[PDB]
Design a protein around this ligand. Structure first.
Ligand SMILES: *C(=O)[C@]1([C@@H](O)[C@@H]2C=CCCC2)NC(=O)[C@H](CCF)[C@]1(C)O
Lengths: 250, 242, 212, 244, 233, 241, 204, 198
């Protein structure tokens, strides 16, 4: 027994490529399209809920995950890899930040933590890189709203708007045409729905699409009252109904 | 690839056999055991005239009653010598007596097969076998003068005379005819000097060859160049004598 | 116990008593309190018999190992620091030792290091260790001269131990003498204190307060 | 066993070269170029951002210039994620030194340590090396302004001007051509931009594709100041130097 | 074929074989011959010591493990040392903890188990030596044959090493005879030397070439070499 | 965790990884050392693949291990640092426990042991470095010069060279160095060292650095001029014929 | 025996109108022996101030630790740490040594650079936070300080007035403590500027 | 305890340390030098527990000499004192703490000023014009508080120390067998072989 794979599984090829990272990126390309758009007063991330069977209950599978009360994530590529990455991200936000400073980490730093975890699977012994690309959207007092992309290599970059997966090329092109630095959150949501429609083959409704935003504080989602400084989470997943309402104004 | 402790189809350990090949490429070393002591001689074999020949140490003291000569990847012998010296001194601390030559040899040979990448038997943390063979010579009250050949195989044989290194097969054949149970220390000295001269590429002199011995009375001693130069001169004369 | 060592023109004099006691019980009158580390190095033992005997013998093994490794005689400074550093690793565990490491090397000349279980290591000219030390110091301090002859130095050391053997209940039995030269130490006998006392009293005229 | 799948990242080629280091360097040669130029009154760090989009958020971006200390900074060429790992440990070594001696860490001490970390991945552990090359720009009171460089092998050297990443051969020749010992920070700033401008594999050299930094000793103060130019600041210096 | 499945002991061949183990067994065959046989009162070990040169010694092939047990080896000497040392410790443990002499059958089980571990785990190698164990315990005389595969068998007599088949057929023939040589060691040994000479070819067993060991009823395992074996040549 | 045997024997009895470690040494800049009657000189060459370096801060080729001993090398630079650091640490340890600085042979034997160890330890490759260690034993005036290589082998030389084209410069030294009358002067010793380097450096005043070591911790490195002067006086020895 | 009574010293922090003040004595003794009259117990990381009383070796160590941590914080966060955040950092750093604590009594003072709100806090040796609105005391003369503060203090004092108050609280408390005194320094802190004044007091 | 005094004058730092080494009932040595040179311009004096004292001093000496060789530079006195304080601050919370108190006297060749640092075994460090460890301060500080001047010459400093030692020899119960005095300045460290009657 005993993991005896203490050597890297990702290494440099004569051309300077890191094969396993490239292949991981290839897996991401086959993944369902997901995207994110930053507005002046919010950020939206969305993706398609590609139900693998009509007997499956799509709700019991959230591709859009809350990491902190002001940060959420979405992805493209291997769902299982994403699921564990979310468990680890939620935990590091605590162990490496909240337990130290008594406040949640700012979007860029948590992204940095996630990225590190991914970088390590690119060099540590006996592992393969994560086959996913994430899009993290969040908000923190001193940085405002932000949107980041994290790739299998562990590299990350901030975006005004972007898409990953299957039809990223097309979707990115469509976003560049509609994006401006004056979009309000509702505008971004609308643009998100339009961009996502081009990537969806079949049914396009609030049961096949998953969408969340980082916007104003939801004091109604807090669960308690009595502390003025605690106003509620900025992260909010939209309901199937809320989505359909906006699809009629499509 | 292939494990470092893999068996060949003929029942031999590859790394050990390949080890023996490196030892064949080493400088010649010869030992002769007599009832008057044991002689140990080696071929310095310097690689350049600028190399100070006396900084070549292929004959070393283990303890006052034990000396040893090496052949092969000599850098590999340092930890072996170290282990040997520690073993001899440790024995004396625990038993207030000298360690027997055979026990000292058996202890050095115990390190031999301690190599591999995780062999289920203990913790053999050594990536490859030693690439050097040794001639351990000494004296002890129970078995008198003794000469041992310790190989990277962990096995050690006792000999009346033995040669190791590049000219071993030839030198050994010579020792076969020259050795007899009544040789005197002086005869053994000249005899070792003569065989080294035959197998050495260079013309043997007191600078590219070195002699030593161990006697019950004075223990292990390395002959200084002057002492050897004379013995060399004496050898040339007896040879030119017929 | 009374042990002493001093440096002089002829090298080093080492003198010790040979009594062992546990409380008021005289366990022995013939114990060795000098360890012959090797032909050139001597060590004195005060405090715990086992501790000194064990570690000073072990020291000898370290010295030998050094000489095989460096093909050169170990210095007294280095030999004494091996013991010192070893003992220091055990600080607080309860080792009990007061010792003198004595040697004569070409490089250093006559050298004496005091080494104890507290981790103290002192180079010096004169040292006395043991319950009888103060007695030996009085005799040594008032008769010591660097220009003493090997003969007189030997006597001074023997006399100093005698002084202590007489007054100190824990010292006595016999006196063991050593002379340390650059070529090694020379044993100078075992002198029963019983006989030695009377002889010295008569010949010297000292110990007048004792009826003989 | 596992041996079967071991790439053996730390062995010599028959020519005495380290495969992985060589391949990592190959990887680095495709990274956006970074330049370092040391003047009498300061140091200039300039780098070209590899790949960009209209939607990329440049104001919040940083992929080549990192602050290690208040007196030391580095320009990166290679895998950003690998770089951050090293940058973080470097930032920690600096503070360990500060806490121990109550003095900011001399530039070379920090560079040597980081290079030693790199060298390790080269001789033991069976892991791939970091695909990163650094240009260190710093200041200390023993050697004043200093410029260093370290690559995957763990080797480092000091320079008056140097570059890492893509087209270093070309970039180096241009620098060796116009560099002068008595240069001034402003001269160096201009030389850096011109050099990148000629080696770029892109159409034009715009501000949105650059990162710029300077370590100067602001006369009106007496202390050292690091300046990591902002998008608009780069855009300005770009028009001034005659590149618009 | 074979070449692809014999790189280590953790690999079965398509027919269910373990080549590394088999190759180890080959080291035994290459080893000098040694014979073991017993009556109801004694057990004897006769081994042919092989020499390197005519200037070399004839390597010892018998190791005492306790006052009532010992063995003979054929193959890698070092491995025999490791295995006998382990046996010495097990005999010792039995005495110190239970004040009980280790049963020869128990020793055989222990050796089998120790060898087995070196045939199912990566990184290790099988032992490359064969062993013949003789002893006298609470159930009389015993003779055991140990193989690196981990297979240990109790026999009335046997032989391992080069040309061992000679002595083996002889003993399988002489069976009814020697098994009754009770109360007479010299006879049992002579029968042992007669079985071993049945594997000669090269030379003839000399004084510094023959090695004999015996154990039994009132005889603690003792080894005879040289002059002491002269009266059997 | 990683303990793969990277340095093992091949059928012909060679350890290729140690062999290839030497190839790395042949590739490194040349280094030479010659002992006079009262000093030892160490000269190294300076590459020129790239020139625009800051000589002030760029690591020099000769390193002090203690105040009376220096070390130069040919091979992987990154690798040398590891050995230099270990040697320096060992030098202080030896002073702390023996109350005496290391002899040159002791320090050499130490570095060599570290190198040997990296040839038969799992998970590590041998050092791609060969060294020249020179100095004077404490309270001794006899010059010392030793050489070590990847395998861990070491020995003392009257003069020696390592690195690229060391074959060439060694020949020069073999037919230009007389053990009967070693360079009786710091000056004529430094000259012989520069002469030997010029056989391969091909005019390189700034491509040649010398360091002189004298008894009692007297160590000093020459400046471009001081050396350039030696070069000049030597080119004339030629032309004047 | 008592680690918090070996070296001596006090620290006091107060809030005022759009300002905060933190002061300390300068003594460092060895029981009854005065050793230094220049041992300041107030430090600052960016605009956040930290006063630490107790065992001097720990006061020095803690300062070096927080300088180290706030330096890394700034390099990653790209902004200077705030009073509220730093207080949490102090608290968790102290609790991390719950069963082998630093023998100190930290006090934090500063103005939040974004809300302009004045902030002060005290801690016990294991991190328990006391976030007072008025004042915080610490040291070998903390009883005396409580007495001085509970009487002399009043809300919304202007910087120049708070200076007189904080100083009189410090000074008179120190003169009733054998282990405090030998000088004193007061810090007046505002959003834009910070003034440091050394006071004149008895030297016995 | 032993006598450990330090005085920082205009251009140098002087350290006076008692010569006696007493063990129980007997004074074993009267020429003990309780000091170690850490670097050409940095001297450290020490007192405390029997074995810890020298072991610690030499350990620090070894580390600073190693730093000097590696960097071919001499750490400033402030840097060295910080290194020492941290070593002692780790030691106090270790299994068996070093019970050693020290004075570090060094000449900062960059600032061109002498510096005196007092650090106890807990890792308590302070920079002073003059200092001491143990009871020494109790008898001498009133004298130093009185006669000390920042512009004193090395000669005036020696005279002030002499006065301190005389007070120590009059009022202290133990015979510390005089002191060894050492001066540290821009030219290094030297010993005043003549203080037995200066
Ligand atoms: C002297 O030190 C004592 C001796 O018994 C031992 C015995 C052998 C050699 C070392 C010294 N040690 C004692 O503990 C004992 C009583 C002390 F009070 C002794 C006789 O003085």
């Amino acid at each position: 027994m005993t993991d005896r794979y203490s050597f890297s599984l990702t290494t440099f090829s004569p051309s300077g490529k890191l094969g396993q990272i490239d292949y991981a990126l290839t897996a991401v390309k086959q993944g369902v399209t997901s995207l994110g758009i930053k507005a002046t007063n919010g950020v939206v991330i969305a993706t398609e809920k590609k139900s693998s069977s009509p007997l499956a209950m799509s709700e019991t599978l959230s591709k859009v995950s809350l990491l902190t009360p002001d940060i959420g994530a979405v992805y493209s590529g291997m769902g299982p890899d994403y699921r564990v990455l979310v468990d680890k991200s939620r935990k590091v936000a605590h162990t490496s930040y909240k337990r130290i400073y008594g406040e949640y980490p700012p979007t860029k730093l948590l992204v940095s933590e996630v990225a590190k975890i991914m970088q390590e699977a690119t060099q540590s012994g006996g592992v393969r890189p994560f086959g996913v690309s994430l899009l993290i959207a969040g908000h923190d007092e001193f940085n405002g709203f932000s949107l980041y992309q994290v790739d299998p290599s562990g590299s990350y970059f901030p975006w005004k708007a972007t898409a990953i997966g299957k039809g990223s090329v097309a979707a990115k092109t469509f976003l560049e045409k509609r994006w401006n630095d004056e979009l309000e959150l509702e505008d971004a949501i609308h643009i998100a729905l339009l961009t996502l429609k081009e990537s969806v083959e079949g049914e396009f409704n609030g049961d096949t699409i998953e969408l969340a935003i980082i916007g104003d504080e939801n004091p109604d989602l807090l669960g308690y009252t009595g502390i003025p400084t605690d106003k509620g989470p900025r992260f909010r997943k939209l309901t199937s109904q809320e989505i359909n309402d906006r699809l009629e104004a499509l | 690839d292939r494990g470092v402790s893999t068996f060949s189809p003929e029942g031999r350990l590859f790394q050990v056999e390949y080890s023996l090949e490196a030892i064949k490429l080493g400088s010649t070393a010869i030992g002769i055991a007599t009832k008057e002591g044991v002689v140990l001689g080696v071929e310095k074999r310097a690689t350049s005239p600028l190399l100070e020949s006396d900084s070549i140490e292929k004959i070393v003291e283990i303890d006052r009653h034990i000396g040893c000569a090496m052949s092969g990847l000599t850098a590999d012998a340092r930890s072996m010598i170290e282990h040997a010296r520690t073993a001899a001194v440790t024995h004396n601390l625990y038993y207030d007596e000298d360690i027997n030559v055979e026990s000292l040899t058996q202890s050095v040979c115990d390190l031999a097969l301690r190599f591999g990448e995780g062999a289920s038997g203990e913790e053999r943390l050594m990536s490859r076998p030693f690439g050097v063979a040794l001639l351990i010579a000494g004296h002890d009250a129970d078995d008198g003068y003794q000469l041992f050949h310790a190989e990277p195989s962990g096995t050690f044989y006792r000999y009346n005379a033995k040669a190791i290194g590049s000219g071993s097969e030839g030198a050994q054949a010579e020792l076969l005819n020259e050795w007899h149970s009544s040789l005197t220390l002086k005869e053994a000295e000249l005899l070792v000097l003569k065989i080294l001269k035959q197998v050495m590429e260079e013309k043997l002199d007191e600078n590219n060859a070195q002699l030593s011995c161990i006697t019950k009375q004075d223990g292990f001693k390395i002959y200084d160049n002057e002492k050897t130069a004379e013995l060399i001169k004496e050898l040339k004369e007896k040879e030119a004598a017929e | 116990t009374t042990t002493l060592a001093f440096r002089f023109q002829g090298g080093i004099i080492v003198a010790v008593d040979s009594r062992a006691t546990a409380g008021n019980w005289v366990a022995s009158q013939t114990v060795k309190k000098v360890i012959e580390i090797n032909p050139f190095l001597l060590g004195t033992m005060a405090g715990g018999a086992a501790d000194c005997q064990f570690w000073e013998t072990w020291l000898g093994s370290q010295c030998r190992l050094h000489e095989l490794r460096e093909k050169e005689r170990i210095s007294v400074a280095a030999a004494s620091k091996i013991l010192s550093n070893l003992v220091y690793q055990y600080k607080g565990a309860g080792l009990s030792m007061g010792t003198m490491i004595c040697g004569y090397t070409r490089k250093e000349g006559p050298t004496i290091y005091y080494v104890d279980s507290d981790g103290t290591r002192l180079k010096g000219d004169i040292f006395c260790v043991g319950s009888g030390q103060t007695f030996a110091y009085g005799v040594l301090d008032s008769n010591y001269k660097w220009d003493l002859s090997v003969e007189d130095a030997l006597y001074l050391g023997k006399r100093s131990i005698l002084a202590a053997a007489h007054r100190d209940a824990y010292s006595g039995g016999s006196v063991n003498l050593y002379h340390v030269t650059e070529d090694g130490w020379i044993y100078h006998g075992n002198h029963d204190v019983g006989e030695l006392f009377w002889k010295v009293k008569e010949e010297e005229g000292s110990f007048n307060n004792v009826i003989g | 066993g596992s041996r079967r799948y071991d790439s053996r990242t730390t062995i010599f080629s028959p020519e005495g070269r380290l495969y992985q280091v060589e391949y990592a360097l190959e990887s680095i040669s495709h990274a956006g170029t970074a330049i370092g130029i040391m003047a009498s009154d300061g140091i200039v760090l300039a780098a070209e951002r590899k790949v960009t989009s209209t939607l990329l958020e440049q104001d919040t971006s940083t992929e080549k210039l990192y602050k290690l200390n208040d007196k030391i900074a580095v320009a990166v060429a290679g895998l950003t994620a690998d770089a951050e790992i090293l940058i973080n440990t470097a930032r920690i070594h600096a503070q360990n030194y500060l806490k121990t001696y109550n003095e900011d860490i001399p530039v070379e001490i920090l560079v040597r340590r980081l290079s030693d970390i790199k060298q390790g991945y080269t001789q033991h552990g069976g892991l791939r090396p970091f695909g990163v090359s650094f240009i260190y720009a710093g200041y200390d009171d023993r050697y004043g302004y200093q410029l260093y460089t370290s690559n995957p092998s763990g080797n480092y050297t000091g320079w008056k001007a140097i570059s890492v990443g893509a087209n270093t051969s070309a970039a180096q020749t241009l620098l060796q051509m116009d560099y002068k010992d008595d240069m001034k920070v402003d001269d160096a700033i201009e030389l850096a931009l011109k050099t990148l401008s000629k080696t770029t594999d892109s159409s034009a050299l715009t501000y949105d594709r650059l990162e710029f930094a300077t370590i100067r000793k602001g006369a009106n103060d007496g202390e050292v100041y690091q300046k990591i130019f902002k998008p608009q600041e780069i855009k300005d210096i770009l028009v001034k130097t005659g590149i618009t | 074929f074979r070449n692809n499945y014999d790189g280590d002991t953790v690999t079965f061949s398509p027919t269910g074989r373990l080549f590394q183990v088999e190759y180890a067994l080959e080291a035994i065959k290459q080893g000098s011959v040694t014979v073991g046989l017993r009556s109801n009162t004694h057990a004897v070990l006769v081994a042919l010591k092989r020499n390197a040169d005519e200037l070399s010694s004839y390597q010892k092939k018998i190791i005492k493990c306790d006052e009532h047990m010992g063995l003979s080896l054929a193959g890698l000497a070092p491995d025999a040392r490791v295995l006998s040392n382990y046996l010495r410790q097990q005999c010792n443990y039995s005495s110190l903890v239970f004040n009980r002499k280790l049963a020869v059958e128990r020793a055989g089980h222990l050796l089998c188990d120790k060898a087995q571990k070196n045939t199912q785990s990566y990184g290790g190698r099988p032992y490359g030596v064969g062993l013949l164990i003789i002893g006298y315990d609470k159930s009389g005389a015993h003779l055991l044959e140990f193989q690196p595969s981990g297979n240990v068998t109790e026999l009335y007599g046997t032989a391992i090493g080069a040309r061992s088949q000679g002595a083996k057929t002889y003993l399988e023939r002489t069976l009814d005879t020697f098994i009754k040589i009770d109360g007479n060691p010299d006879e049992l040994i002579k029968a042992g030397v007669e079985a071993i000479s049945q594997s000669l070819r090269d030379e003839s067993l000399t004084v510094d070439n023959l090695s004999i060991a015996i154990v039994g009823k009132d005889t603690p395992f003792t080894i005879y070499d040289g002059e002491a074996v002269a009266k059997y040549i | 965790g990683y303990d793969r045997a990277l340095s093992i024997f091949s059928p012909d009895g060679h350890i290729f990884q140690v062999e290839y470690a030497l190839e790395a040494v042949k590739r490194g800049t040349c280094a030479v050392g010659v002992k006079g009657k009262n000093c030892v000189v160490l000269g190294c060459e300076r590459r020129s693949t790239l020139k625009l370096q800051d000589t002030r801060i760029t690591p020099s080729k000769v390193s002090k291990i203690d105040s009376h001993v220096v070390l130069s090398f040919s091979g992987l630079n990154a690798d040398s640092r590891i050995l230099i650091e270990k040697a320096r640490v060992e030098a202080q340890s030896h002073r702390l426990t023996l109350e005496d600085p290391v002899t040159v042979e002791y320090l050499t034997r130490y570095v060599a042991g570290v190198q040997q160890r990296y040839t038969q330890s799992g998970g590590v490759r041998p050092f791609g470095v060969s060294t020249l260690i020179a100095g004077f034993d404490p309270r001794d005036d006899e010059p010392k010069l030793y050489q070590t290589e990847p395998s861990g082998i070491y020995s003392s030389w009257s003069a020696q060279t390592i690195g690229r084209n060391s074959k060439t410069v060694r020949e020069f030294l073999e037919k230009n160095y007389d053990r009967k009358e070693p360079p009786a002067t710091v000056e004529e010793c430094v000259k012989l060292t520069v002469r030997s380097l010029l056989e391969v450096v091909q005019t390189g005043a700034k491509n040649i650095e010398i360091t002189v070591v004298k008894p009692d911790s007297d160590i000093v490195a020459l400046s471009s001029e001081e050396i350039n002067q030696y070069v000049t006086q030597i080119e004339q020895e030629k032309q004047e014929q | 025996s008592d680690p918090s009574s070996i070296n001596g010293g006090i620290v006091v922090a107060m809030t005022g109108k759009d300002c905060v003040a933190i002061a300390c004595d300068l003594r460092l003794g060895s029981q009854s022996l005065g050793v230094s009259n220049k041992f300041e117990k107030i430090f600052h990381y960016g605009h956040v101030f930290l006063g630490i009383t107790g065992l001097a070796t720990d006061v020095t160590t803690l300062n070096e630790m927080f300088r180290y941590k706030t330096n890394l914080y700034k390099l990653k966060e790209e902004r200077a740490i705030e009073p509220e955040t730093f207080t949490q950092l102090v608290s968790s750093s102290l609790y991390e040594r719950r069963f082998g604590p630093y023998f100190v009594g930290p006090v934090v003072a500063g103005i939040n650079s974004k809300s302009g709100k004045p902030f002060i806090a005290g801690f016990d040796l294991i991190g328990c936070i006391d976030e007072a609105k008025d004042f915080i005391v610490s040291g070998t003369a903390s009883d005396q300080l409580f007495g001085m503060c509970e009487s002399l203090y009043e809300p919304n004092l202007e910087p120049e007035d708070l200076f007189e108050t904080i100083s009189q609280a410090l000074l008179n408390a120190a003169d009733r403590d054998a282990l405090s005194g030998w000088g004193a320094v007061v810090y007046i802190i505002k959003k834009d500027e910070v003034v440091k004044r050394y006071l004149k007091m008895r030297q016995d | 305890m032993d006598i450990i005094l330090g005085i920082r004058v205009q251009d140098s730092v002087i350290l006076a340390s008692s010569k006696a080494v007493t063990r129980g009932i007997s004074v074993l040595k009267d020429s003990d030098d309780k000091t170690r040179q850490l670097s050409p311009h940095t001297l450290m004096s020490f007192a405390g527990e029997a074995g810890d004292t020298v072991q610690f001093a030499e350990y620090i000496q070894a580390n600073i000499q190693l730093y000097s060789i590696r960097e071919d530079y001499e750490l400033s006195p402030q840097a060295v004192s910080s290194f020492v304080r941290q070593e002692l601050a780790k030691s106090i919370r270790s299994r068996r703490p070093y019970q050693v108190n020290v004075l570090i006297g060094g000449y900062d060749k960059k600032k061109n000023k002498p510096e005196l640092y007092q650090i106890d075994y807990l890792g308590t460090k302070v920079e002073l014009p003059y200092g001491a460890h143990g009871y020494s301060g109790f008898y001498t500080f009133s004298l130093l508080d009185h006669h000390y001047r920042p512009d004193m010459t090395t000669e005036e400093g020696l005279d002030l120390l002499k006065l301190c030692v005389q007070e120590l020899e009059k009022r202290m119960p133990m015979d510390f067998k005089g002191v060894i005095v050492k001066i540290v300045d821009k030219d290094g460290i030297r010993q005043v072989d003549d203080f037995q009657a200066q």
